[PDB]
């Protein structure tokens, strides 16, 4: 019937004055665009069909052609920026927003999907969707006493589209729109469906990536405890965005970080710092580095949860990027910590793995490690233990590496290493 039509046939059917022929041709187009291999998006665009599909969106009297043209346009907007732009240039945004109020749930769902793709292109189309007024009808779709009454797929598509309205930077979404969306996001963040939870966590992670004022908007809604709970989920697709959000949050002020600590996040980190997914270990160690950049009481809470041996472990054996984040964690720790906390760090066996990392090719991590070693030596100076630390660094073969760094291409490395060997290692 409508299977395997040529673009030529589709054009001939859409250009007839027969509404049913147009319906058949539009369904054929939808089926072309929903095939698994190489959907002919550009051929459909070049045929001039987008304006006709957009016009079909407004045929309230023919519900099926509304649905079919909505689906076809959704799939065109799913492609490149140019193809999405072609959909927007056809006037599709206000037409889809009008469909959001359709009495047919499959048609409003399809409009939700289309707006999601359009907004997902980037900041400009996101803000253009917001300017046309999509947020009010979108949120109205979710204004029900219990989300569990909504169809699973309907709710999932709504959540994903909302997440796309929170997505992208330069610029971030309008602050007023974020304020309008956040309550519904919190509600979705407490829903029992894993996909809804994943997309809500992604939305929160987008909103928390920016200046501390944005983080404050999110944190004021009290979502941090729920984020920690989700940080402990079995579903990796949930843990990943939850951990991203928690990290973003701890990039902010010390009080915002303390909200994460008080919610119990640190208790989850023994798993995260040994998680078998490299990305999880990397994100978790980055989060750790930003916590050890906090107050001394926050460093102390890191100590109390027994996380220092886990940092020693990550520094000893892990993907190199994770090791780089761990080096940052150590340098922040040693710069902000007390002498007692730095001594504890040394008693956990930081020196040997720290030295093994001085043979690395990355120049920046060398700078970081030399800064950490310097900090530890300042603590030792306060205790008169500089000589014991010198011996300890020598016995594991570290002095050799430090000396070899004197003859290094980078100037900062040169200065730091020469200063270290001159002031401590004779």
């Amino acid at each position: 019937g409508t299977v395997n039509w040529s673009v030529e046939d589709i054009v001939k059917g859409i250009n007839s004055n027969n509404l049913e022929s147009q319906l058949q041709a539009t369904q054929a187009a939808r089926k072309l665009l929903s095939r698994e291999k190489q959907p002919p998006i550009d051929n459909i665009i070049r045929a001039g069909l987008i304006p006709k599909f957009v016009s079909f969106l407004g045929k309230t009297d023919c519900s099926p052609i509304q649905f079919e043209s909505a689906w076809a346009l959704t799939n065109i907007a799913s492609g490149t920026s140019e193809q999405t732009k072609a959909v927007v240039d056809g006037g599709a945004i206000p037409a889809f927003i009008s469909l959001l109020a359709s009495p047919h749930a499959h048609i409003s769902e399809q409009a939700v999907w289309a707006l999601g793709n359009i907004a997902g292109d980037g900041s400009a189309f996101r803000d253009l969707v917001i300017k046309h007024g999509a947020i009010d009808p979108l949120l109205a779709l979710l204004a029900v006493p219990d989300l569990s009454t909504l169809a699973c797929g309907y709710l999932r598509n709504l959540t994903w589209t909302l997440s796309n309205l929170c997505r992208n930077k330069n610029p971030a979404p309008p602050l007023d729109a974020v304020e309008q969306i956040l309550p519904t996001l919190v509600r979705l963040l407490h829903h029992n469906d894993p996909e809804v939870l994943a997309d809500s966590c992604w939305a929160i992670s987008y909103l928390t990536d920016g200046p501390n004022e944005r983080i404050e908007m999110v944190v004021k809604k009290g979502v941090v405890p729920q984020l920690v709970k989700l940080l402990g989920a079995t579903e990796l697709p949930i843990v990943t965005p939850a951990l991203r959000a928690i990290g973003n949050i701890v990039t902010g002020t010390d009080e915002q970080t303390q909200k994460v600590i008080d919610a119990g996040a640190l208790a989850v980190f023994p798993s995260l710092l040994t998680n078998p997914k490299t990305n999880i270990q990397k994100e978790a160690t980055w989060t750790m580095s930003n916590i050890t950049a906090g107050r001394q009481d926050q460093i102390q809470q890191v100590v109390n949860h027994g996380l220092v041996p886990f940092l020693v472990g990550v520094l000893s054996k892990a993907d190199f990027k994770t090791q780089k984040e761990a080096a940052w964690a150590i340098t922040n720790y040693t710069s902000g910590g007390t002498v007692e906390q730095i001594v504890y760090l040394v008693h956990c066996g930081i020196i040997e793995p720290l030295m093994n990392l001085l043979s690395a090719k990355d120049t920046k991590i060398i700078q970081v490690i030399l800064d950490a070693i310097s900090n530890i030596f300042q603590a030792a100076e306060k205790l008169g233990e500089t000589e014991k630390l010198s011996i300890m660094i020598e016995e594991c073969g570290g002095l050799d590496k430090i000396e070899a760094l004197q003859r290094h291409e980078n100037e900062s490395v040169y200065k730091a290493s020469l200063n270290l060997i001159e002031k401590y290692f004779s």
Binding site: L33, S34, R35, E36, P39, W71, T74, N75, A77, S78, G79, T84, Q110, W113, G116, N117, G120, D121, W160, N164, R167, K169, A198, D199, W202, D209, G247, N248, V250, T251, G252, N279, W286, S289, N290, A293, W328, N332, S335, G336
Partner: peptide
């Protein structure tokens, strides 16, 4: 001391419907 993400993988921003 605090380092932000941009300083120096996500889900797909677009979804094609195949149903």
């Amino acid at each position: 001391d605090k380092k932000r993400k941009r300083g120096m993988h996500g889900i797909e921003s677009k979804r094609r419907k195949k149903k």
